[PDB]
């Protein structure tokens, strides 16, 4: 409902960290408003952990804590072509994410750029990893292949555990679409968030 | 730790 999307974009303002220069403040407006549909519960766990979603107006590794990644081809974009410099989000220990990229096709083939990042942050910093727990490699040995990419989501039980993430939390058409083709990834998430 | 998007 209309306080707890407020709530959520309170907590996002502790949290989210804008560019300097010039940028598209809509666009960063239009990003955070999609993170503020993530459950509170995990949005107040990362204002917590002092985790930034660092919104970036250039390349990631332009930024001194990514430039280590310069040339360096991601897991799974192997064949692609492309590197870290080419890549337009990062999830984990960190969030940067390049606005304008959020849509699929921008660069990445992910449903949305900025909750699968954050997924990424959930999992590893909130929830200690959980996508590698045994539970969910069982439900990713079953469900895995059923989002499509299967090369990449079928092969990594993080980036499944990401994507399935984001379409529960992008929108009521994502969110059935996984639920019809991922039930027990959908019951783990809707539990998850008790 | 890092990830990227889907490919
Ligand atoms: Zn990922």
Redesign the interface.
Known sequence: DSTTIQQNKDTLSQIVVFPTGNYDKNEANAMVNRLANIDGKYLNALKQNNLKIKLLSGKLTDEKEYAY?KGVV????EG?G?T?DD????????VALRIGFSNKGKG???IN?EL??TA?AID?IVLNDISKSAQFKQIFAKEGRSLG?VN??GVYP??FF??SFAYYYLNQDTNSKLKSACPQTYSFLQNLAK | EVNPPVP
Not at chain 1, 74 to 77: A, D, E, F, H, L
Not at chain 1, 87 to 94: D, K, M, R, Y
């Open positions: 990644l991601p897991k799974g974009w692609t492309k870290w890549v337009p989000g990062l999830g984990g220990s960190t990445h083939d992910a750029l699968h990042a990424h590893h990419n990449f989501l993080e980036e990401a994507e």
